Design a protein around this ligand. Structure first.
Ligand SMILES: [Ca+2]
Ligand SMILES: [Ca+2]
Ligand SMILES: [Ca+2]
Ligand SMILES: [Ca+2]
Ligand SMILES: [Ca+2]
Length: 279
């Protein structure tokens, strides 16, 4: 399958080279996989989700995404037009309020919720969690992300937007999950992207067009936008039987575009998520 005039990030993850416009992907498109988007919620009614999105948990008064950030991330995972894994099942877990903030205790509860909730969903190709969030180092937040990964979920987390070593941020600094840096359309490290030894992978994170609330779209930038590329790519590869939740991050790193990125500090991986699609 070939989506012409795709958002640059989708094109990028199906190319060895920057500056292409076509997203090439296997038609299976993550069908049979589940991705939990642990965020501000998902506007499941957005036509771009084609009925494949549903809120499964909220830690606030409403499950509605009053912010947009969760809906954007969900759109990069699995919307029709903006998504890596266009046939994945999206499940919204609202751990962030409508300002995009959330207490650590709530984010941890939302991770533990996914680890349990996945057991009562039909996700035959496996389960992914996309955590486009983060704050300062917290051993308890990292432990929660480690548990969710251990439970058999491919956890992808944002490296953070501090232009600093991700070692000081959580859950970015949890070694066992897939910590995702951001790149731009020219294969530079996104100016804001965290870096460091704990990064597993980069994905497109600068000027990412996806779904927004009110049935809209917009382009925003962040390691929050890179993370769902990787989460969707994991869902896609798991559906293709190429990898499993336990190994997807390593598989994505192993199969990444290597050495393509500029402004990668020594000791940070130079790896850009790539689906290796061959028609
Ligand atoms: Ca290349
Ligand atoms: Ca709910
Ligand atoms: Ca709220
Ligand atoms: Ca972040
Ligand atoms: Ca890791």
């Amino acid at each position: 399958a070939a989506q012409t005039n795709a958002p640059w990030g989708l094109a990028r993850i199906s190319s060895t080279s920057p500056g292409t416009s076509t997203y090439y992907y296997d038609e299976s498109a993550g069908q049979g996989s589940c991705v939990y988007v642990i965020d501000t919620g998902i506007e499941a009614s957005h036509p771009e989700f084609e009925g494949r999105a549903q809120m499964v948990k909220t830690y606030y008064y409403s499950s509605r995404d009053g912010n947009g950030h969760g809906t954007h991330c969900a759109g990069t995972v699995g919307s029709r037009t903006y998504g890596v894994a266009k046939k994945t099942q999206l499940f919204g877990v609202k751990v962030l309020d409508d300002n995009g903030s959330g207490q650590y205790s709530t984010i941890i509860a939302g991770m533990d919720f996914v680890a349990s909730d996945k057991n009562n969903r039909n996700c035959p190709k496996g389960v992914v969690a996309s955590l486009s969030l983060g704050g300062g180092y917290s051993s308890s937040v990292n432990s929660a992300a480690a548990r969710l990964q251990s439970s058999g979920v491919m956890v992808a987390v944002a490296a953070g937007n501090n232009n600093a070593d991700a070692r000081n941020y959580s859950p970015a600094s949890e070694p066992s999950v897939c910590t995702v840096g951001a790149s731009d359309r020219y294969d530079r490290r996104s100016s804001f992207s965290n870096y460091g030894s704990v990064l597993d992978i980069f994905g497109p994170g600068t000027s990412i067009l996806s779904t927004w609330i009110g049935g809209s779209t917009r382009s925003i930038s962040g390691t929050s936008m890179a993370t769902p590329h990787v989460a969707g790519l994991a869902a896609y590869l798991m559906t293709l039987g190429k990898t499993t939740a336990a190994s997807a991050c390593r598989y994505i790193a192993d199969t990444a575009n290597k050495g393509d990125l500029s402004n990668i500090p020594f000791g940070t991986v130079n790896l850009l998520a790539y689906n290796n699609y061959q028609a």
